[PDB]
Design a protein around this nucleic acid. Structure first.
Ligand SMILES: [Zn+2]
Ligand SMILES: [Zn+2]
Lengths: 65, 98, 645, 147
DNA sequence: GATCATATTGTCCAGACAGT
DNA sequence: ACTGTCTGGACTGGTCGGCGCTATGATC
RNA sequence: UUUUUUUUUUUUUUUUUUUUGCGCCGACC
């Protein structure tokens, strides 16, 4: 199963969080966002919404529940 | 093992079987394969020596339905069906060779 | 909520492996509803005798269900052959079913006593030689459609049933023996009123709903037809899904009418604890109610799939069987004597903290059908009693002269060649009338056939399917002797309208027992229409006739009744037949019966709650009990909560 | 760059997006970002400088059908990136349809709305008696808006 | 090993029409 | 106002019998 | 040394009587 972090909204397959090292990950999330370039327009839009998102390219989630 | 396990013979077998059973060849052709006539000894040989034309049966193909002079020794001049198949469904002559 | 079912299961497994010898080979231990299931690889060592199983059940205080491991399972054909060879030929086995998922074989036999054994040793022998846990049910002498359908539904949905049972067992044993801080009783319906009964038992840990029913008299008004869904406690229980279980006292629309409505809107997902006769009769009654509502043109309350879901969520309990339905509540059922499968609900909350007995509809005098209600309990503190006949002047006539008058009226009618038409309920008084008629005809008094039309045949078949729930006389006749009173050749069933027309047109005398006491539907109306002009015939009323019904019009003495004909014109029915009324066959307890039950109950309850009756009747009964015995009595209204402890 | 739409099989947008992302990572495709909202079914958004890059990225995948010949303005997909509760935007008194949950395919009337617990209380319109039920905000769909 | 959404978008005659 | 071009359509009735064809890929 | 709220009775039972379509091929008149 794939779970998303509650802090940086990063989806990872292991317990450790490779972005902020948070131990609270949520198994329920929607609207998967894939970031390949940091300077992307949608990455910039997500940055002003969630400050911790789009710091490192990879999978991301819009909301955590 | 990786290559062998990725091959499904069922698709090819079913495609060939369906085409040979229904008679509908790929490309829109129909009637390619028909059930063998087993009424008597003559019907089976006639069906095995049958030649058909791709032209439509409803259209009058006056130039194509009539017996041609080049059919001597290749197409039987008398054995033709009655109706829309007259002149379009032919039979091989006894001396004909392909 | 937090649960400790895993720790309890681990402790139980440790106790088992401490007590059970190692050669048994215990593999898995789990909970299936209110009983414990143990899987072993060597059933021979586990159950060489019943003493080990009895000791395990006594120590664990659970119902032990030993099943073989699924890996060691005989082929179904070899298993069937071995079961047939082991069972004596006297027990006629009809159907044998197997469950591949869990070790269990269902055996349908005409004589389940021989299959079970004198002390259960035959079941152990079968499950040892065949490695299949046996479950024995009775094949009725008369085929029943409802029971066959229920068994087929249960067999075809084995996976869902097993999942539901496992979930129920996990929810029941979420924690060990817990002492409740307080016990609360609230009545969502049936308090100071008749119909739409609903009783909620609330503790600090578990919630229990008792006889969730519907009202038919006030069906036009939604505020009185259904129990109070606006109660804050009931809303909190339903919204959070905290309802542990639902128990139905007996199969009647005022006690089980609203049950499929909860499953229609997915408001409930737990188990239902009724006796098998109660389950079958309530399914039949709910189906009939849905069909009637559909035929009347109104919107049906629920759907047959909801009744199927009710069947799939029903756990069957026998009389005197103690089962754990909650972490702090223990439930047992005792005979009530009202109808077939009628049970008095006894709740044992805590480890001796409190005891509640909800009698519901019951009878305390011996009858031709069922034994009198059980008045002895291991412990009793609060008693909930019906007050249908709680008035001071309410005194039903005794049974013997009422049945003598019925017999003499029927004999007089048959002497002149007339026909006897007896409108009756689907269940209850009809079977008692058939038993009385069979007793009268067994000595050669009457030879005319007795015709049952409508649901009478189905109810009779359901009654035959469960002879152990009947009275001691019928039980002795069926078991000790080879004579079945219900299997008399005089009882005939009419299949279609052609048979009914032949019966009506026949000049030979006959007795017809229809299925509509008020002549408001069914074959009763047709029989009355086709037999009214004949002066030799007679009609006997054995139940109260409500105002506005045809039966009340005939009973009052109307010689002619205008009705709508088939062509749309008014038709006149000339009632030249004799009219008789014998209301001595009511299954409800009399006021004298209620007083005798209060006086003779053991132990004496601390308080008595009077429900299920009119407000003045309930108040009169409570005042009479308080003045005669000194016990504190209350007659609360709806939405009233009483803190018992 | 520019937002482009890729038509994919309904209910399997996340897997197609993941395969496209993996292919772009492995083969160094000039793909900027990929957005696949859960509410949108059968369509995903890929940010690329030109549609040729999208066409080259989505080819070779059975589940990527075609790329829509057009460019989406950023204001159209701006609201998708913003995080808003599903309960928000609902007012009591209107009629909603429950897409998922135990009450699938049932119409209900909204009674109570609270954004703290992200839950909405509704009453079934087909029930003969009002029984309020608690359901998730994302499970319901607004049929009509009245009061 | 069982289920669940989804599953792609033959020539000739007569009437209407751009072209000069 | 003529003239070549594009497009739509209907393709004789009945009867006999036979011969196939009416899911699939991906989790849980 | 101080303002602006109101008050009472009429609707009944625990429930009921029969393979469609698609296309192909052969053939008769
Ligand atoms: Zn993180
Ligand atoms: Zn009752």
């Amino acid at each position: 199963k794939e779970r998303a972090c509650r802090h940086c909204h990063y989806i990872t397959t292991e317990d450790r969080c490779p972005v902020c090292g948070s131990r609270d990950l949520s198994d329920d999330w929607f609207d998967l966002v894939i970031v390949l370039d940091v300077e992307s327009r949608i990455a910039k839009k997500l940055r002003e919404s969630i400050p911790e998102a789009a710091k490192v390219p990879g999978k991301y989630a819009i909301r955590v529940r | 093992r990786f290559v062998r396990n990725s091959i499904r013979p069922d698709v090819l077998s079913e495609r060939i079987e369906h085409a040979l059973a229904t008679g509908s060849w790929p490309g829109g052709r129909t009637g390619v394969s028909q059930l063998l006539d087993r009424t008597n000894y003559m019907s089976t040989l006639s069906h095995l020596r049958r030649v058909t034309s791709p032209l439509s049966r409803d259209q009058p193909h006056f130039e194509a339905r009539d017996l041609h002079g080049t059919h001597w020794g290749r197409i039987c001049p008398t054995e033709t069906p009655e109706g829309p198949n007259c002149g379009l469904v032919k039979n091989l002559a006894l001396m004909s060779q392909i | 909520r937090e649960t400790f079912v895993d720790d309890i299961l681990k402790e139980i497994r440790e106790i088992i492996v401490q007590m059970v010898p190692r050669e048994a080979g215990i593999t898995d231990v789990e909970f299936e509803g209110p009983e414990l299931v143990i899987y072993v690889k060597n059933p021979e060592a586990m159950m060489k005798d019943g003493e080990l199983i009895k000791n395990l059940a006594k120590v664990l205080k659970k119902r032990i269900s030993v099943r073989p491991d699924p890996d060691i399972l005989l082929p179904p054909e070899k298993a069937e052959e071995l079961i047939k060879q082991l069972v004596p030929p006297e027990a006629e086995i009809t159907n044998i079913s197997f469950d591949p998922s869990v070790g269990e074989v269902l055996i349908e036999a005409r004589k389940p006593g021989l299959v079970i054994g004198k002390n259960g040793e035959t079941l152990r022998l079968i499950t040892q030689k065949v490695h299949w846990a046996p479950r024995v049910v009775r094949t009725p002498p008369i085929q029943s459609q409802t029971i066959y359908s229920i068994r087929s539904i249960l067999q075809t949905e084995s996976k869902d049933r097993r999942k539901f049972l496992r979930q129920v067992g996990r929810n029941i044993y979420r924690k060990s023996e817990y002492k409740s801080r307080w016990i609360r009783i609230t009545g969502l319906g049936g308090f100071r009123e008749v119909g739409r009964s609903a009783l909620l038992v609330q503790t600090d840990e578990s919630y229990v709903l008792v006889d969730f029913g519907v009202n038919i008299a006030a069906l036009k008004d939604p505020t009185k037809a259904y129990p109070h869904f606006d109660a804050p406690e009931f809303r909190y229980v339903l919204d959070e899904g905290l309802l542990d279980a639902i128990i139905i006292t007996h199969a009647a629309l005022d006690h089980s009418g609203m049950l499929p409505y909860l499953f229609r809107y997915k408001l409930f997902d737990g188990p239902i604890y009724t006796t098998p006769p109660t389950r079958d009769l309530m399914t039949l009654l709910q189906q009939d109610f849905i069909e009637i509502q559909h035929m009347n043109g109104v919107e049906p309350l629920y759907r047959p799939k909801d009744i199927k879901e009710v069947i799939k969520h029903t756990i069957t309990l026998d009389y005197g069987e103690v089962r754990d339905i909650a972490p702090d509540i223990r439930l047992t059922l005792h005979n009530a004597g009202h109808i077939l499968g009628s049970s008095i609900v006894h709740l044992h909350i805590g480890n001796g903290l409190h005891n509640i007995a909800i009698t519901g509809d019951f009878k305390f005098i011996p009858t031709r059908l069922f034994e009198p209600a059980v008045s002895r309990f291991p412990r009793l503190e609060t008693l909930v009693m019906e007050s249908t006949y709680g008035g001071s002047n309410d005194y039903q006539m005794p049974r013997e002269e009422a049945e003598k008058r019925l017999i003499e009226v029927i004999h007089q009618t048959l002497k002149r060649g007339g026909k006897v038409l007896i409108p009756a309920m689907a269940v209850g008084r009809a079977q008692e009338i058939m038993m009385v008629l069979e007793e009268y005809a067994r000595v050669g008094g009457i030879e005319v056939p007795i015709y049952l039309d409508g649901m009478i045949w189905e109810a009779t078949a359901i009654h035959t399917a469960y002879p152990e729930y009947l009275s001691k006389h019928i039980r002795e006749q069926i078991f000790h002797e080879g004579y079945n009173p219900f299997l008399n050749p005089i009882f005939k069933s009419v299949a279609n309208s052609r048979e009914r027309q032949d019966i009506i047109d026949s000049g030979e005398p006959a007795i017809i027992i229809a299925t509509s006491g008020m002549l408001v539907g069914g074959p009763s109306v047709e029989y009355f229409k086709q037999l009214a002009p004949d002066p030799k015939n007679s009609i006997i009323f054995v139940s109260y006739q409500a105002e506005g019904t045809l039966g009340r019009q005939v009973q009052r003495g109307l010689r002619e009744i205008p009705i709508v004909g088939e062509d749309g014109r008014t038709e006149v029915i000339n009632v030249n037949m004799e009219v008789h009324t014998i209301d001595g066959f009511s299954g409800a307890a009399d006021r004298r019966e209620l007083m005798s039950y209060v006086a003779r109950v053991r132990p004496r309850p601390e308080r008595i709650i009077t429900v299920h009756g009119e407000a003045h009747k309930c108040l009169d009964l409570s005042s009479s009990i308080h003045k005669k015995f000194g016990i504190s009595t209350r007659a609360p209204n709806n939405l009233d909560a009483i803190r018992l402890k | 760059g520019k937002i482009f739409t890729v038509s994919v099989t309904v209910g399997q947008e996340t897997t197609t997006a993941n395969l496209i992302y993996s292919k772009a990572k492995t083969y160094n495709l000039p793909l900027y970002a990929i957005l696949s909202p859960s509410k949108v079914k059968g369509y995903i958004f890929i940010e690329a400088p030109n549609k040729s890059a999208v066409e080259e990225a989505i080819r070779g995948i059975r589940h990527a059908k075609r790329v829509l010949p057009g460019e989406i303005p950023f204001s159209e997909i701006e609201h998708f990136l913003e995080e808003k509760p599903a309960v928000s935007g609902f007012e009591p008194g209107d009629i909603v349809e429950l897409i998922a949950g135990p009450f699938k395919g049932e119409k209900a009337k909204v009674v109570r709305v609270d954004e703290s617990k992200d839950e909405i209380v509704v009453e079934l319109v087909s029930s003969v008696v009002p029984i309020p039920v608690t359901v998730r905000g994302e499970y319901v769909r607004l049929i009509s808006k009245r009061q």
